[PDB]
């Protein structure tokens, strides 16, 4: 029948990273807090030339080249970001110009912290599924630079990058179950970043509680619809165990284990026989290492080497999962949990396509990660102290983009040769 | 059959306005430049308590009350704005909390200058038309405060306010022709507002050319699809003349006459017999006072009393049109042209519903406009010089909202009794 969803994806990362244990030592922190406590390995760091536009355009151009997209088939170009660079002019319009895309497309940005990319994805999917986008494709780019500041609690969860999603009626990566999404949103101050403040404000432990609360509501909403649709059942297997994999928004890699335990607790607490269990027995079952290993563990390879990329984090988890398991997963249904502070969560599902492995091979993700260079904490700090209008005098890699200067309040970019 | 579109709308305006001729005199400008040249009458002015959130929440709460919306049926709450107040936390999340709305909805903001509201509207329409939103409604709020600065060319086109749109399968105001939209977008610097800059940057005459260029492409794209669908024909009537009315984005009221002339020129230049005409004869026909009067003139009553409200301007034009003509227009197809700088235009159509007059009566728009107070240019200037975190010590009207203070970087609001 008709299908809609994600056809392909591409990734862009900053040119530099730091080793997370170096950061710990520079901060007088036990490095195992970062490697074991948070699950981090390497943290992307930026200079001002790697702004939201440059990363988004690099990813979207890479998508078009790698997947041989006909640019004139794009009817929607949406950038999900919380790292906007103008109050009015959207990142999507800059990307359109840098890529020299034609005119017959909607362009806009979507904003809700780390949920903005998913919001744009659903707008593109539903544009197609309504019939309005029939025959065309969308490109939805998640682009962000996560900045908490030197000597702050959030600093080891920084990162940056972009994931460009191709959305179409040929959803080779993920044929989405339209209309089955669960959502949970409420007005909170767990994380925010007032206009003009370069660094975020966060109550990190409260943000974890909000994430898990919103996840629970979103997951339960999806589960009710999936049960009614016959996709999962209350059987000897918990409903959530019937998803082949579940990918979660990853502000730090150990959050996926917390999220999966919470999702399983939702099933265990809601089961018709929950009264026969105890909090202790439910928690021990929910924390099942076997379930985490089977459904979640292989989704974190890219995230652990990049850091938090806000809107893109879930989609880097999807990328890492499919990078290695797309063939195995063809024909199987997986789940995805998007969260953004502020806050909103959305849980959705889809079926991996027969051609997913092909599309992932063309994304050539190990090459993307291999182009990077390690720098010192000293150099990371120097770059952090640069104003946003002071890009380093450095060329972009071939086909990639950098901000070069701001002249008369107009942002100027270069494309690498 | 199935229908989707705008069911109802509500409007919020700032509590104060200035007479536009007073502004001219304070600036040493001939007042006829503003009243005849631009078409302005009154300009909304704000104090910092009337921020994007307060205006959006006032409009959305008014919509819910006036239309007796069941808040638990809302599955999407989207705010289109270019007056965002956080890089991360969306206006939509604040509105959700202020209105005490429940949790089962997507929340996010959409951004592309004055096109952001339309982008969100299409996301909501297509969510419903895909089937995902079947049985539910969306609220899409266009909220903005247009600020160019004292003694600037854009100053007489300032304004502020919000329009909240109810979107549903019962689109009593406008049953939209899904999939027929035309769109035209390209990367330009006609107007923009860098992060942290309170006042916009604009090349006003270039922005007019970009508006008219993008309108032409968007209108032609719609027209091709409408011709193929049989909704309009190349007959003795121009295709565009077969729309009962056309509503245009209104940065200033005289822009509607420019836009309508351009739309008609698109028909006259593209007609199979265009070679028999001259630029002079086509322009004289395009500028037809009879066509402007028949299709456009009655859409500007609210805009002329408020000013530019960026994302909301087109929807204030729709509101003013339907305020007086909804019964006459029931069963008739109208056109709508959205533009945002940066830039993007989208042209779409829909049919006004039999119950549109009922829904407009409940919006009680003359009462909304009557609650305002006139102030001096001196007082407008004093309020302009207030920092964004210094609201006046003034209560909100009943059921309306104001920002009261920012405390520990958290925005605080009050609801009027
Ligand atoms: C994530 C964040 C809250 C961590 O903050 P913190 O208060 O410095 O760290 P914690 O004290 O919570 O310690 C983190 C973990 O490391 C563990 N840990 C600490 N030292 C350790 C060590 N030497 N060896 C092993 N583990 C260690 C802690 O026990 C804790 O484990 P837990 O996850 O089981 O609780 C913080 O970096 C932050 O605010 N980040 C930004 C916001 C964010 O990403 N929030 C996520 C919301 S979903
Ligand atoms: C709209 C804007 C460009 C006007 O700027 P301006 O350069 O000061 O004004 P103009 O010189 O163009 O004059 C405006 C009109 O008033 C007319 N006018 C001037 N003085 C007049 C008078 N005394 N009596 C009658 N008409 C008069 C001009 O002839 C002109 O008419 P036209 O529309 O036929 O060209 C400016 O206010 C601006 O930049 N606004 C913000 C951006 C904007 O809204 N742009 C719209 C893009 S769609």
Question: Can you give chain B as a three-state secondary structure string?
Answer: CCCCEEEEEEEECCCEEEEHHHHHHHHCCCHHHHHHHHCCCEEEECCCCCCHHHHHHHHHHHHHHHHCCCHHHEEEEEEECCCCCECCCCHHHHHHHHCCCCCCCEEEEEEECECHHHHHHHHHHHHHHCCCCCCCEEEEEEEEEECCCCCCCCHHHCEEEEEEEEEECCCCCEEECCCCCEEEECCCCCEECECCCCCCEECHHHHHHHHHHHHHHHHHHHHHHHHHCCCCCCCCCCHHHHCCCEEECCCCCHHHHHHHHHHHHHHHHHCCCHHHCCHHHHHHHHCCHHHHHHHCHHHCCCHHHHCCCHHHHHHHHHHHHHHHHHHHHCCCEEEEEEEECCCEEEEEEEECCCCHHHHHHHHCHHHHHHCCEECCHHHHHHHHCCCCCCCCCCCCCECCEEEEEEECCEEEEEEEC
Looking at beta carbons, which residues of chain B come within 8 Å of A129? Answer: 126, 130-132
Kindly give the pairing relationship between strand B5-12 and strand B174-176.
Answer: antiparallel
- Is A36's C-beta closer than 6 angstroms to any atom of ligand 1? yes
Residue nearest to atom 22 of ligand 2 (CA): B33
Taking the centre of ligand 1 as the mean of its atom positions, its distance from the CA of residue A304, in whole angstroms, is 15
State whether residue A243 is helix, strand or coil.
coil
Q: Are B394 and B163 in contact (CB under 8 A)?
A: no
Experimental method: X-ray
Tell me the resolution in Å: 1.5
- Is B37's C-beta closer than 6 angstroms to any atom of ligand 2? yes
CA distance B20 to chain A (A): 25
Pick the residue of B57, B121, B130 with the most A CBs within 10 A to test the interface with A by mutation: B130
Give the up-direction half-sphere exposure of residue B227: CA atoms within 13 A in the CB hemisphere.
15
Q: What are phi and psi of A219, to 5 degrees?
A: -60, -45
CA-based nearest residue to A315, from A257, A249, A399: A249
CA-based nearest residue to A393, from A385, A381, A382, A405: A405
Looking at beta carbons, which residues of chain B come within 8 Å of A154? Answer: none
CB contact under 8 A, A192 and B409: yes
Instruction: Please report which ligand is nearest the Cα atom of A253.
Output: 1
CA-based nearest residue to B145, from B84, B210, B196: B84
The CATH number given to whatever domain includes residue A136 is 3.40.47.10
Q: What are phi and psi of B143, to 5 degrees?
A: -140, 130
Cα angle at B121 between B119 and B122, to 5 degrees? 65
Q: Which residue has the tokens 């960026």?
A: B310
Taking the centre of ligand 1 as the mean of its atom positions, its distance from the CA of residue A338, in whole angstroms, is 20
**CA A60/CA A70 separation, integer angstroms:** 13
DSSP secondary structure code for residue A234 in this structure: S
- In the residue annotation, B114 being an active-site residue is answered as yes
Total domain count, chain B: 1
Residue nearest to atom 6 of ligand 2 (CA): B153
Cα angle at A210 between A209 and A212, to 5 degrees? 65
| Number of neighbours of residue A299 by Cβ within 10 angstroms | 27
CB contact under 8 A, A83 and B86: no
Largest pairwise CA distance in chain B = 69
Among B7, B42, B50, B82, the active-site one is: B82
| For the CA of A207, the nearest atom of ligand 1 | 47
Q: Are A351 and A174 in contact (CB under 8 A)?
A: yes
DSSP H or E stretch at residue A267 = helix A254-270
- Alpha-carbon distance values, B129 to A5, B224, B260 (Å): 16, 22, 30
CA distance B11 to chain A (A): 22
Q: Are A48 and A95 in contact (CB under 8 A)?
A: no
Range of the domain at A315: 1-417
CA distance B208 to chain A (A): 16
What part of B 339-378 touches A (C-beta under 8 Å)?
340-344, 346
**CA A23/CA A32 separation, integer angstroms:** 11
């Amino acid at each position: 029948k008709k299908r809609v969803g994600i056809e392909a994806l591409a990734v862009a990362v900053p040119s530099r990273y730091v080793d997370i244990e170096d950061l710990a030592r520079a901060r007088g922190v036990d490095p195992a807090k970062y490697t074991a406590g948070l699950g981090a390995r390497e943290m992307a760091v930026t200079d001002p030339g790697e702004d939201t536009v440059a990363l988004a355009a690099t990813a979207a151009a890479r998508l078009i080249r790698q997947q041989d997209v006909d640019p004139s088939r794009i009817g929607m170009l949406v950038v999900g970001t919380e790292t906007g660079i103008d109050h009015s002019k959207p990142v999507a319009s800059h990307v359109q110009g840098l890529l020299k895309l034609p005119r017959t497309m909607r362009t806009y940005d979507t904003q809700h912290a780390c949920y903005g990319g998913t919001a744009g994805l659903m707008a593109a999917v539903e544009w197609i599924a309504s019939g309005a986008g029939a025959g065309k494709v969308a490109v939805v780019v998640c682009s962000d630079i996560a900045r908490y500041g030197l000597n702050t609690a959030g600093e080891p969860t920084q990162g940056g990058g972009a994931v460009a999603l191709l959305v179409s009626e040929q959803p080779d990566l993920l044929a989405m179950d339209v209309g089955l999404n669960g959502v949970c949103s409420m007005d909170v101050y767990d994380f925010w970043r007032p206009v003009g403040r370069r660094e975020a404000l966060v109550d990190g432990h409260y943000s974890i509680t909000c994430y898990l609360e919103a996840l629970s509501g979103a997951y339960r909403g999806w589960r009710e619809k999936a049960l009614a649709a016959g996709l999962v059942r209350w059987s000897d297997a918990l409903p959530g165990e019937q998803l082949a994999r579940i990918a979660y928004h990853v502000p730090f890699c150990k959050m996926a284990r917390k999220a999966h335990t919470q999702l399983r607790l939702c099933d265990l607490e809601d089961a018709a026989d929950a009264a026969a269990s105890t909090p202790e027995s439910r928690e021990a079952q929910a924390k099942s290492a076997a379930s985490y290993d089977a459904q979640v563990a292989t989704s974190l390879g890219l995230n652990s080497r990049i850091g938090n990329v806000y809107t893109a984090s879930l989609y880097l988890a999807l990328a890492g999962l499919l990078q290695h398991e797309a063939g195995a997963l063809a024909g199987q249904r997986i789940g995805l949990l998007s969260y953004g502070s502020g806050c909103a969560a959305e849980f959705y599902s889809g079926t991996v396509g027969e051609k997913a492995a092909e599309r992932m091979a063309k994304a050539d993700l190990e090459a993307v990660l291999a182009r990077r260079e390690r720098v010192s904490i000293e150099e990371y700090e120097r770059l952090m102290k640069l104003p946003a209008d002071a890009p380093e005098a450095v060329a972009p890699s071939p086909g990639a983009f950098r901000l070069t200067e701001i002249r008369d309040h107009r942002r100027q970019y270069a494309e690498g040769n």
